[PDB]
PDB file of all heavy atoms in Angstrom:
ATOM      1  N   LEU A 241     -63.415  76.105  99.553  1.00 12.83           N
ATOM      2  CA  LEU A 241     -62.403  76.780 100.347  1.00 12.83           C
ATOM      3  C   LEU A 241     -61.338  77.510  99.524  1.00 12.83           C
ATOM      4  O   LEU A 241     -60.925  78.603  99.881  1.00 12.83           O
ATOM      5  CB  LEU A 241     -61.813  75.828 101.394  1.00 12.83           C
ATOM      6  CG  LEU A 241     -62.857  75.827 102.515  1.00 12.83           C
ATOM      7  CD1 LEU A 241     -63.216  74.450 103.060  1.00 12.83           C
ATOM      8  CD2 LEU A 241     -62.518  76.839 103.640  1.00 12.83           C
ATOM      9  N   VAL A 242     -60.927  76.894  98.398  1.00 12.47           N
ATOM     10  CA  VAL A 242     -59.974  77.552  97.475  1.00 12.47           C
ATOM     11  C   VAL A 242     -60.614  77.889  96.097  1.00 12.47           C
ATOM     12  O   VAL A 242     -61.723  78.411  96.086  1.00 12.47           O
ATOM     13  CB  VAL A 242     -58.619  76.803  97.428  1.00 12.47           C
ATOM     14  CG1 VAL A 242     -57.522  77.778  97.060  1.00 12.47           C
ATOM     15  CG2 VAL A 242     -58.307  76.255  98.790  1.00 12.47           C
ATOM     16  N   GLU A 243     -59.963  77.678  94.942  1.00 14.14           N
ATOM     17  CA  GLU A 243     -60.563  78.198  93.674  1.00 14.14           C
ATOM     18  C   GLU A 243     -61.442  77.287  92.787  1.00 14.14           C
ATOM     19  O   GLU A 243     -62.491  77.751  92.354  1.00 14.14           O
ATOM     20  CB  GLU A 243     -59.615  79.056  92.832  1.00 14.14           C
ATOM     21  CG  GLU A 243     -60.023  80.554  92.808  1.00 14.14           C
ATOM     22  CD  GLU A 243     -59.280  81.332  91.688  1.00 14.14           C
ATOM     23  OE1 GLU A 243     -59.593  81.103  90.509  1.00 14.14           O
ATOM     24  OE2 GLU A 243     -58.403  82.183  92.017  1.00 14.14           O
ATOM     25  N   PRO A 244     -60.985  76.059  92.436  1.00 14.95           N
ATOM     26  CA  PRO A 244     -59.616  75.550  92.448  1.00 14.95           C
ATOM     27  C   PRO A 244     -58.946  75.622  91.057  1.00 14.95           C
ATOM     28  O   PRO A 244     -58.008  74.864  90.771  1.00 14.95           O
ATOM     29  CB  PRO A 244     -59.782  74.100  92.940  1.00 14.95           C
ATOM     30  CG  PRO A 244     -61.190  73.687  92.453  1.00 14.95           C
ATOM     31  CD  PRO A 244     -61.956  74.985  92.119  1.00 14.95           C
ATOM     32  N   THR A 245     -59.442  76.540  90.203  1.00 17.71           N
ATOM     33  CA  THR A 245     -58.760  76.927  88.958  1.00 17.71           C
ATOM     34  C   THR A 245     -57.393  77.580  89.239  1.00 17.71           C
ATOM     35  O   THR A 245     -56.483  77.462  88.430  1.00 17.71           O
ATOM     36  CB  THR A 245     -59.610  77.896  88.066  1.00 17.71           C
ATOM     37  OG1 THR A 245     -60.473  78.703  88.877  1.00 17.71           O
ATOM     38  CG2 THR A 245     -60.422  77.102  87.034  1.00 17.71           C
ATOM     39  N   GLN A 246     -57.269  78.267  90.364  1.00 16.38           N
ATOM     40  CA  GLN A 246     -56.032  78.888  90.806  1.00 16.38           C
ATOM     41  C   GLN A 246     -54.832  77.911  90.809  1.00 16.38           C
ATOM     42  O   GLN A 246     -53.682  78.340  90.701  1.00 16.38           O
ATOM     43  CB  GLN A 246     -56.220  79.431  92.210  1.00 16.38           C
ATOM     44  CG  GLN A 246     -55.436  80.699  92.526  1.00 16.38           C
ATOM     45  CD  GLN A 246     -55.485  81.065  94.026  1.00 16.38           C
ATOM     46  OE1 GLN A 246     -54.979  82.101  94.434  1.00 16.38           O
ATOM     47  NE2 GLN A 246     -56.091  80.210  94.828  1.00 16.38           N
ATOM     48  N   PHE A 247     -55.130  76.618  90.960  1.00 15.82           N
ATOM     49  CA  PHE A 247     -54.089  75.574  91.057  1.00 15.82           C
ATOM     50  C   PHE A 247     -53.626  75.001  89.729  1.00 15.82           C
ATOM     51  O   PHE A 247     -52.436  74.726  89.561  1.00 15.82           O
ATOM     52  CB  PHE A 247     -54.529  74.420  91.941  1.00 15.82           C
ATOM     53  CG  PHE A 247     -54.680  74.815  93.369  1.00 15.82           C
ATOM     54  CD1 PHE A 247     -55.862  74.543  94.060  1.00 15.82           C
ATOM     55  CD2 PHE A 247     -53.631  75.456  94.035  1.00 15.82           C
ATOM     56  CE1 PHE A 247     -55.997  74.894  95.386  1.00 15.82           C
ATOM     57  CE2 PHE A 247     -53.761  75.823  95.363  1.00 15.82           C
ATOM     58  CZ  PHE A 247     -54.924  75.536  96.042  1.00 15.82           C
ATOM     59  N   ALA A 248     -54.548  74.768  88.801  1.00 14.92           N
ATOM     60  CA  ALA A 248     -54.178  74.510  87.408  1.00 14.92           C
ATOM     61  C   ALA A 248     -53.289  75.658  86.907  1.00 14.92           C
ATOM     62  O   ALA A 248     -52.228  75.417  86.367  1.00 14.92           O
ATOM     63  CB  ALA A 248     -55.421  74.306  86.511  1.00 14.92           C
ATOM     64  N   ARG A 249     -53.700  76.907  87.149  1.00 15.54           N
ATOM     65  CA  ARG A 249     -52.936  78.093  86.703  1.00 15.54           C
ATOM     66  C   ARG A 249     -51.518  78.239  87.302  1.00 15.54           C
ATOM     67  O   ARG A 249     -50.551  78.629  86.587  1.00 15.54           O
ATOM     68  CB  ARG A 249     -53.746  79.368  86.964  1.00 15.54           C
ATOM     69  CG  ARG A 249     -54.602  79.825  85.779  1.00 15.54           C
ATOM     70  CD  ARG A 249     -55.282  81.158  86.076  1.00 15.54           C
ATOM     71  NE  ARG A 249     -56.578  80.926  86.714  1.00 15.54           N
ATOM     72  CZ  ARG A 249     -56.809  81.023  88.018  1.00 15.54           C
ATOM     73  NH1 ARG A 249     -55.828  81.340  88.866  1.00 15.54           N
ATOM     74  NH2 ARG A 249     -58.028  80.795  88.468  1.00 15.54           N
ATOM     75  N   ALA A 250     -51.385  77.956  88.597  1.00 15.74           N
ATOM     76  CA  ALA A 250     -50.067  77.961  89.213  1.00 15.74           C
ATOM     77  C   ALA A 250     -49.139  76.911  88.559  1.00 15.74           C
ATOM     78  O   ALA A 250     -48.013  77.207  88.172  1.00 15.74           O
ATOM     79  CB  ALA A 250     -50.193  77.715  90.704  1.00 15.74           C
ATOM     80  N   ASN A 251     -49.656  75.679  88.430  1.00 10.02           N
ATOM     81  CA  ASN A 251     -48.873  74.532  87.942  1.00 10.02           C
ATOM     82  C   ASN A 251     -48.438  74.704  86.477  1.00 10.02           C
ATOM     83  O   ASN A 251     -47.352  74.264  86.112  1.00 10.02           O
ATOM     84  CB  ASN A 251     -49.602  73.190  88.175  1.00 10.02           C
ATOM     85  CG  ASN A 251     -49.596  72.763  89.670  1.00 10.02           C
ATOM     86  OD1 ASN A 251     -48.742  71.975  90.097  1.00 10.02           O
ATOM     87  ND2 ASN A 251     -50.553  73.303  90.446  1.00 10.02           N
ATOM     88  N   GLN A 252     -49.308  75.354  85.685  1.00 13.67           N
ATOM     89  CA  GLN A 252     -49.028  75.821  84.311  1.00 13.67           C
ATOM     90  C   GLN A 252     -47.932  76.881  84.253  1.00 13.67           C
ATOM     91  O   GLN A 252     -47.017  76.764  83.409  1.00 13.67           O
ATOM     92  CB  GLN A 252     -50.295  76.369  83.623  1.00 13.67           C
ATOM     93  CG  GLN A 252     -50.959  75.401  82.628  1.00 13.67           C
ATOM     94  CD  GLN A 252     -51.155  76.002  81.225  1.00 13.67           C
ATOM     95  OE1 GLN A 252     -50.192  76.240  80.476  1.00 13.67           O
ATOM     96  NE2 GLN A 252     -52.429  76.241  80.847  1.00 13.67           N
ATOM     97  N   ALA A 253     -48.010  77.914  85.111  1.00 12.71           N
ATOM     98  CA  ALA A 253     -46.896  78.889  85.261  1.00 12.71           C
ATOM     99  C   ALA A 253     -45.535  78.185  85.560  1.00 12.71           C
ATOM    100  O   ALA A 253     -44.506  78.484  84.889  1.00 12.71           O
ATOM    101  CB  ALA A 253     -47.204  79.984  86.341  1.00 12.71           C
ATOM    102  N   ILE A 254     -45.529  77.279  86.538  1.00 11.74           N
ATOM    103  CA  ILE A 254     -44.306  76.491  86.832  1.00 11.74           C
ATOM    104  C   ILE A 254     -43.773  75.711  85.619  1.00 11.74           C
ATOM    105  O   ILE A 254     -42.583  75.806  85.306  1.00 11.74           O
ATOM    106  CB  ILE A 254     -44.498  75.555  88.039  1.00 11.74           C
ATOM    107  CG1 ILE A 254     -44.975  76.353  89.255  1.00 11.74           C
ATOM    108  CG2 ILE A 254     -43.168  74.845  88.351  1.00 11.74           C
ATOM    109  CD1 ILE A 254     -45.649  75.496  90.371  1.00 11.74           C
ATOM    110  N   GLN A 255     -44.633  74.907  84.982  1.00  9.82           N
ATOM    111  CA  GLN A 255     -44.243  74.189  83.747  1.00  9.82           C
ATOM    112  C   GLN A 255     -43.687  75.136  82.673  1.00  9.82           C
ATOM    113  O   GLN A 255     -42.648  74.814  82.081  1.00  9.82           O
ATOM    114  CB  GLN A 255     -45.365  73.291  83.181  1.00  9.82           C
ATOM    115  CG  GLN A 255     -45.677  72.054  84.031  1.00  9.82           C
ATOM    116  CD  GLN A 255     -44.421  71.397  84.645  1.00  9.82           C
ATOM    117  OE1 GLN A 255     -43.489  71.025  83.914  1.00  9.82           O
ATOM    118  NE2 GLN A 255     -44.400  71.252  85.957  1.00  9.82           N
ATOM    119  N   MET A 256     -44.360  76.292  82.489  1.00 10.00           N
ATOM    120  CA  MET A 256     -43.886  77.351  81.561  1.00 10.00           C
ATOM    121  C   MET A 256     -42.510  77.929  81.906  1.00 10.00           C
ATOM    122  O   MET A 256     -41.644  78.113  81.030  1.00 10.00           O
ATOM    123  CB  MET A 256     -44.951  78.458  81.383  1.00 10.00           C
ATOM    124  CG  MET A 256     -45.104  78.956  79.912  1.00 10.00           C
ATOM    125  SD  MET A 256     -45.200  77.650  78.604  1.00 10.00           S
ATOM    126  CE  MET A 256     -46.670  76.672  79.031  1.00 10.00           C
ATOM    127  N   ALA A 257     -42.298  78.221  83.202  1.00 10.96           N
ATOM    128  CA  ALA A 257     -41.006  78.699  83.719  1.00 10.96           C
ATOM    129  C   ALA A 257     -39.899  77.648  83.542  1.00 10.96           C
ATOM    130  O   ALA A 257     -38.843  77.976  83.063  1.00 10.96           O
ATOM    131  CB  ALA A 257     -41.101  79.169  85.172  1.00 10.96           C
ATOM    132  N   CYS A 258     -40.180  76.385  83.883  1.00  8.75           N
ATOM    133  CA  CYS A 258     -39.228  75.264  83.634  1.00  8.75           C
ATOM    134  C   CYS A 258     -38.840  75.130  82.160  1.00  8.75           C
ATOM    135  O   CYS A 258     -37.681  74.957  81.836  1.00  8.75           O
ATOM    136  CB  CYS A 258     -39.799  73.948  84.127  1.00  8.75           C
ATOM    137  SG  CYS A 258     -39.821  73.964  85.934  1.00  8.75           S
ATOM    138  N   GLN A 259     -39.815  75.257  81.245  1.00  7.32           N
ATOM    139  CA  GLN A 259     -39.534  75.099  79.834  1.00  7.32           C
ATOM    140  C   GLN A 259     -38.635  76.257  79.370  1.00  7.32           C
ATOM    141  O   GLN A 259     -37.638  76.025  78.662  1.00  7.32           O
ATOM    142  CB  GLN A 259     -40.820  75.066  79.049  1.00  7.32           C
ATOM    143  CG  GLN A 259     -40.555  75.023  77.560  1.00  7.32           C
ATOM    144  CD  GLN A 259     -41.382  76.024  76.798  1.00  7.32           C
ATOM    145  OE1 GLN A 259     -41.039  77.229  76.725  1.00  7.32           O
ATOM    146  NE2 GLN A 259     -42.464  75.549  76.218  1.00  7.32           N
ATOM    147  N   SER A 260     -38.990  77.482  79.782  1.00  3.91           N
ATOM    148  CA  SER A 260     -38.203  78.701  79.497  1.00  3.91           C
ATOM    149  C   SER A 260     -36.801  78.650  80.099  1.00  3.91           C
ATOM    150  O   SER A 260     -35.836  79.034  79.464  1.00  3.91           O
ATOM    151  CB  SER A 260     -38.942  79.961  79.991  1.00  3.91           C
ATOM    152  OG  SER A 260     -40.260  79.994  79.448  1.00  3.91           O
ATOM    153  N   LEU A 261     -36.697  78.169  81.341  1.00  2.89           N
ATOM    154  CA  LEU A 261     -35.360  78.054  81.977  1.00  2.89           C
ATOM    155  C   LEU A 261     -34.498  76.985  81.266  1.00  2.89           C
ATOM    156  O   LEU A 261     -33.279  77.106  81.228  1.00  2.89           O
ATOM    157  CB  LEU A 261     -35.511  77.680  83.459  1.00  2.89           C
ATOM    158  CG  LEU A 261     -35.845  78.807  84.481  1.00  2.89           C
ATOM    159  CD1 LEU A 261     -36.280  78.148  85.809  1.00  2.89           C
ATOM    160  CD2 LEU A 261     -34.611  79.725  84.656  1.00  2.89           C
ATOM    161  N   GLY A 262     -35.151  75.928  80.741  1.00  3.97           N
ATOM    162  CA  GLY A 262     -34.479  74.745  80.159  1.00  3.97           C
ATOM    163  C   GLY A 262     -34.204  74.823  78.668  1.00  3.97           C
ATOM    164  O   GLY A 262     -33.065  74.620  78.245  1.00  3.97           O
ATOM    165  N   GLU A 263     -35.231  75.136  77.883  1.00  3.10           N
ATOM    166  CA  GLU A 263     -35.128  75.159  76.412  1.00  3.10           C
ATOM    167  C   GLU A 263     -34.437  76.422  75.814  1.00  3.10           C
ATOM    168  O   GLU A 263     -34.703  77.545  76.286  1.00  3.10           O
ATOM    169  CB  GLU A 263     -36.499  74.896  75.788  1.00  3.10           C
ATOM    170  CG  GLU A 263     -37.055  73.562  76.227  1.00  3.10           C
ATOM    171  CD  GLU A 263     -38.223  73.101  75.395  1.00  3.10           C
ATOM    172  OE1 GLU A 263     -39.064  73.937  74.950  1.00  3.10           O
ATOM    173  OE2 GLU A 263     -38.317  71.850  75.210  1.00  3.10           O
ATOM    174  N   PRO A 264     -33.537  76.240  74.830  1.00  3.32           N
ATOM    175  CA  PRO A 264     -32.782  77.372  74.236  1.00  3.32           C
ATOM    176  C   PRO A 264     -33.612  78.539  73.667  1.00  3.32           C
ATOM    177  O   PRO A 264     -33.059  79.634  73.458  1.00  3.32           O
ATOM    178  CB  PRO A 264     -31.924  76.724  73.136  1.00  3.32           C
ATOM    179  CG  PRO A 264     -31.796  75.310  73.530  1.00  3.32           C
ATOM    180  CD  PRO A 264     -32.987  74.934  74.376  1.00  3.32           C
ATOM    181  N   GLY A 265     -34.912  78.356  73.410  1.00  4.59           N
ATOM    182  CA  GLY A 265     -35.695  79.444  72.776  1.00  4.59           C
ATOM    183  C   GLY A 265     -36.323  80.565  73.631  1.00  4.59           C
ATOM    184  O   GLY A 265     -37.527  80.755  73.572  1.00  4.59           O
ATOM    185  N   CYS A 266     -35.521  81.299  74.420  1.00  6.09           N
ATOM    186  CA  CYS A 266     -36.019  82.478  75.156  1.00  6.09           C
ATOM    187  C   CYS A 266     -34.918  83.546  75.376  1.00  6.09           C
ATOM    188  O   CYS A 266     -33.770  83.177  75.552  1.00  6.09           O
ATOM    189  CB  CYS A 266     -36.634  82.071  76.494  1.00  6.09           C
ATOM    190  SG  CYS A 266     -38.355  81.437  76.467  1.00  6.09           S
ATOM    191  N   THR A 267     -35.295  84.839  75.371  1.00  3.65           N
ATOM    192  CA  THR A 267     -34.348  85.944  75.728  1.00  3.65           C
ATOM    193  C   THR A 267     -34.193  86.021  77.246  1.00  3.65           C
ATOM    194  O   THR A 267     -35.098  85.551  77.968  1.00  3.65           O
ATOM    195  CB  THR A 267     -34.850  87.352  75.289  1.00  3.65           C
ATOM    196  OG1 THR A 267     -35.850  87.814  76.222  1.00  3.65           O
ATOM    197  CG2 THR A 267     -35.428  87.347  73.818  1.00  3.65           C
ATOM    198  N   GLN A 268     -33.100  86.618  77.723  1.00  4.01           N
ATOM    199  CA  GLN A 268     -32.930  86.834  79.163  1.00  4.01           C
ATOM    200  C   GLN A 268     -34.192  87.404  79.827  1.00  4.01           C
ATOM    201  O   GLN A 268     -34.783  86.762  80.712  1.00  4.01           O
ATOM    202  CB  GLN A 268     -31.732  87.689  79.475  1.00  4.01           C
ATOM    203  CG  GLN A 268     -30.428  86.943  79.470  1.00  4.01           C
ATOM    204  CD  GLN A 268     -29.275  87.743  80.042  1.00  4.01           C
ATOM    205  OE1 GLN A 268     -29.455  88.667  80.863  1.00  4.01           O
ATOM    206  NE2 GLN A 268     -28.047  87.384  79.635  1.00  4.01           N
ATOM    207  N   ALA A 269     -34.639  88.592  79.401  1.00  7.17           N
ATOM    208  CA  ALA A 269     -35.881  89.189  79.912  1.00  7.17           C
ATOM    209  C   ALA A 269     -37.054  88.188  80.023  1.00  7.17           C
ATOM    210  O   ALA A 269     -37.760  88.156  81.030  1.00  7.17           O
ATOM    211  CB  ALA A 269     -36.275  90.420  79.076  1.00  7.17           C
ATOM    212  N   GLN A 270     -37.244  87.359  78.989  1.00  3.15           N
ATOM    213  CA  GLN A 270     -38.342  86.394  78.926  1.00  3.15           C
ATOM    214  C   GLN A 270     -38.262  85.163  79.894  1.00  3.15           C
ATOM    215  O   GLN A 270     -39.301  84.666  80.339  1.00  3.15           O
ATOM    216  CB  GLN A 270     -38.497  85.855  77.514  1.00  3.15           C
ATOM    217  CG  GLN A 270     -38.975  86.845  76.468  1.00  3.15           C
ATOM    218  CD  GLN A 270     -38.812  86.268  75.066  1.00  3.15           C
ATOM    219  OE1 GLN A 270     -37.783  85.661  74.756  1.00  3.15           O
ATOM    220  NE2 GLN A 270     -39.843  86.411  74.250  1.00  3.15           N
ATOM    221  N   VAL A 271     -37.051  84.692  80.187  1.00  2.82           N
ATOM    222  CA  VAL A 271     -36.826  83.672  81.223  1.00  2.82           C
ATOM    223  C   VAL A 271     -37.200  84.282  82.596  1.00  2.82           C
ATOM    224  O   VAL A 271     -37.849  83.620  83.419  1.00  2.82           O
ATOM    225  CB  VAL A 271     -35.362  83.186  81.246  1.00  2.82           C
ATOM    226  CG1 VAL A 271     -35.154  82.197  82.402  1.00  2.82           C
ATOM    227  CG2 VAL A 271     -34.965  82.539  79.907  1.00  2.82           C
ATOM    228  N   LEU A 272     -36.790  85.547  82.827  1.00  5.39           N
ATOM    229  CA  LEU A 272     -37.157  86.322  84.029  1.00  5.39           C
ATOM    230  C   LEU A 272     -38.682  86.574  84.275  1.00  5.39           C
ATOM    231  O   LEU A 272     -39.159  86.435  85.429  1.00  5.39           O
ATOM    232  CB  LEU A 272     -36.333  87.612  84.089  1.00  5.39           C
ATOM    233  CG  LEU A 272     -34.830  87.252  84.151  1.00  5.39           C
ATOM    234  CD1 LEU A 272     -33.970  88.447  83.789  1.00  5.39           C
ATOM    235  CD2 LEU A 272     -34.432  86.678  85.531  1.00  5.39           C
ATOM    236  N   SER A 273     -39.423  86.913  83.224  1.00  8.91           N
ATOM    237  CA  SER A 273     -40.873  87.117  83.338  1.00  8.91           C
ATOM    238  C   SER A 273     -41.564  85.807  83.718  1.00  8.91           C
ATOM    239  O   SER A 273     -42.382  85.811  84.650  1.00  8.91           O
ATOM    240  CB  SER A 273     -41.494  87.638  82.048  1.00  8.91           C
ATOM    241  OG  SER A 273     -40.584  88.471  81.394  1.00  8.91           O
ATOM    242  N   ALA A 274     -41.236  84.720  82.987  1.00 10.14           N
ATOM    243  CA  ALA A 274     -41.831  83.395  83.237  1.00 10.14           C
ATOM    244  C   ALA A 274     -41.526  82.826  84.650  1.00 10.14           C
ATOM    245  O   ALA A 274     -42.368  82.153  85.263  1.00 10.14           O
ATOM    246  CB  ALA A 274     -41.409  82.428  82.123  1.00 10.14           C
ATOM    247  N   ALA A 275     -40.333  83.134  85.172  1.00  9.76           N
ATOM    248  CA  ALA A 275     -40.001  82.837  86.587  1.00  9.76           C
ATOM    249  C   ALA A 275     -40.823  83.719  87.603  1.00  9.76           C
ATOM    250  O   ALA A 275     -41.503  83.171  88.460  1.00  9.76           O
ATOM    251  CB  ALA A 275     -38.490  82.911  86.814  1.00  9.76           C
ATOM    252  N   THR A 276     -40.792  85.046  87.454  1.00  9.10           N
ATOM    253  CA  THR A 276     -41.578  86.004  88.287  1.00  9.10           C
ATOM    254  C   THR A 276     -43.114  85.855  88.206  1.00  9.10           C
ATOM    255  O   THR A 276     -43.794  86.098  89.234  1.00  9.10           O
ATOM    256  CB  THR A 276     -41.176  87.485  88.027  1.00  9.10           C
ATOM    257  OG1 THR A 276     -39.756  87.588  88.023  1.00  9.10           O
ATOM    258  CG2 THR A 276     -41.735  88.442  89.096  1.00  9.10           C
ATOM    259  N   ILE A 277     -43.679  85.446  87.056  1.00  7.90           N
ATOM    260  CA  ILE A 277     -45.134  85.122  87.060  1.00  7.90           C
ATOM    261  C   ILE A 277     -45.518  83.932  87.982  1.00  7.90           C
ATOM    262  O   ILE A 277     -46.580  83.961  88.621  1.00  7.90           O
ATOM    263  CB  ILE A 277     -45.872  85.060  85.656  1.00  7.90           C
ATOM    264  CG1 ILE A 277     -45.941  83.641  85.094  1.00  7.90           C
ATOM    265  CG2 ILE A 277     -45.389  86.191  84.644  1.00  7.90           C
ATOM    266  CD1 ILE A 277     -47.241  83.343  84.265  1.00  7.90           C
ATOM    267  N   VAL A 278     -44.624  82.912  88.035  1.00  9.02           N
ATOM    268  CA  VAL A 278     -44.739  81.816  89.028  1.00  9.02           C
ATOM    269  C   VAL A 278     -44.823  82.362  90.480  1.00  9.02           C
ATOM    270  O   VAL A 278     -45.699  81.931  91.231  1.00  9.02           O
ATOM    271  CB  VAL A 278     -43.554  80.770  88.956  1.00  9.02           C
ATOM    272  CG1 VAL A 278     -43.674  79.743  90.087  1.00  9.02           C
ATOM    273  CG2 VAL A 278     -43.499  80.084  87.573  1.00  9.02           C
ATOM    274  N   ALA A 279     -43.935  83.287  90.831  1.00  9.85           N
ATOM    275  CA  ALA A 279     -43.908  83.938  92.161  1.00  9.85           C
ATOM    276  C   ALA A 279     -45.265  84.597  92.554  1.00  9.85           C
ATOM    277  O   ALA A 279     -45.694  84.545  93.706  1.00  9.85           O
ATOM    278  CB  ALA A 279     -42.719  84.961  92.241  1.00  9.85           C
ATOM    279  N   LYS A 280     -45.962  85.178  91.589  1.00  8.80           N
ATOM    280  CA  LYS A 280     -47.228  85.872  91.842  1.00  8.80           C
ATOM    281  C   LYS A 280     -48.429  84.943  91.957  1.00  8.80           C
ATOM    282  O   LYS A 280     -49.335  85.207  92.737  1.00  8.80           O
ATOM    283  CB  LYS A 280     -47.455  86.993  90.828  1.00  8.80           C
ATOM    284  CG  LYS A 280     -46.640  88.264  91.224  1.00  8.80           C
ATOM    285  CD  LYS A 280     -46.486  88.320  92.781  1.00  8.80           C
ATOM    286  CE  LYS A 280     -46.328  89.745  93.255  1.00  8.80           C
ATOM    287  NZ  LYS A 280     -45.882  89.764  94.651  1.00  8.80           N
TER     288      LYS A 280
END
């Protein structure tokens, strides 16, 4: 009914966005991309 690789990929995007939002090592633009890729 679903992928289900699509779900590992979503959850990875979220973990990546959390790390970028939390950890000091990212530029403004880069925190924004990692958040917006989660949205897609």
Side-chain angles (χ1 to χ4, degrees):
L241 281 134
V242 207
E243 250 194 70
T245 30
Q246 213 190 184
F247 293 129
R249 267 185 272 100
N251 287 264
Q252 258 234 70
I254 305 160
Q255 291 320 304
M256 221 45 61
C258 290
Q259 175 228 81
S260 306
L261 280 166
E263 302 194 325
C266 279
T267 78
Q268 279 191 25
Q270 293 168 316
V271 176
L272 300 162
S273 327
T276 314
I277 95 147
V278 175
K280 280 330 207 193

